[PDB]
């Protein structure tokens, strides 16, 4: 900190008002649009859909 802390960045950007959408890994590098993309590198629910 002080600037390095992500809380200060969130307060400055105003995203704290909508922090409910805080994605795991929200940082300056590799924001949600990239964190979600990378998470795909980490389909078998065997659900029974009604094909009507």
């Amino acid at each position: 900190g002080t600037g390095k802390k992500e809380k200060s960045r969130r307060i400055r950007e105003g995203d704290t008002k909508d922090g409910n959408l805080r994605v795991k890994g929200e940082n300056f590098y590799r924001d949600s649009k990239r964190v979600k993309f990378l998470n795909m590198y980490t389909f078998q629910d065997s659900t029974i859909p009604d094909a009507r």
């Binding site: 795909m40 590198y41 980490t42 078998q44 859909p49 094909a51 009507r52």
Partner: protein
């Protein structure tokens, strides 16, 4: 298992890969992306462009190009994937029959439902929804 998992890397512990074992049609706009992005893999051998089409009229079957897929039930994410998944409704180039609707506007494309199971057969059968 239809979303078959293929083990990646020398040490098979981070596969993350899913392969569709169902017939799928894409067309010209396939353009395989870099190998790193192949989250879903539709094998070329399991891709068909011409599906058999028939109607209860004259009993004439003619192979016609597949135009597109509009509505696949049971999680239409398969529709977005273009999988056949017998029971789907797909558009077919019916220009060969040349049937003309009222008003002189010749029709050349109609939606048809796949009758046979392409997963268990090497041919695709559909019936015109006329």
């Amino acid at each position: 298992e239809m979303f078959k998992v293929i083990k990646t890397g020398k040490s098979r512990s981070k596969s993350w890969k899913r392969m569709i074992t169902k017939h799928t049609f894409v067309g010209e706009g396939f353009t395989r992306r870099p190998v790193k992005m192949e989250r879903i893999i539709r094998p070329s051998a399991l891709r068909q462009k011409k599906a058999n089409v028939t109607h209860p009229e004259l009993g004439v079957t003619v192979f016609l190009p597949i135009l597109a897929v509009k509505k696949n039930p049971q999680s239409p994410m398969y529709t977005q994937l273009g999988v056949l998944t017998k029971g789907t409704i797909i558009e077919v180039n019916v220009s060969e029959l040349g049937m003309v609707t009222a008003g002189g506007k010749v029709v050349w494309g109609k939606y048809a439902q796949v009758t046979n199971e392409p997963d268990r057969d090497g041919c695709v059968n559909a019936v015109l929804l006329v």
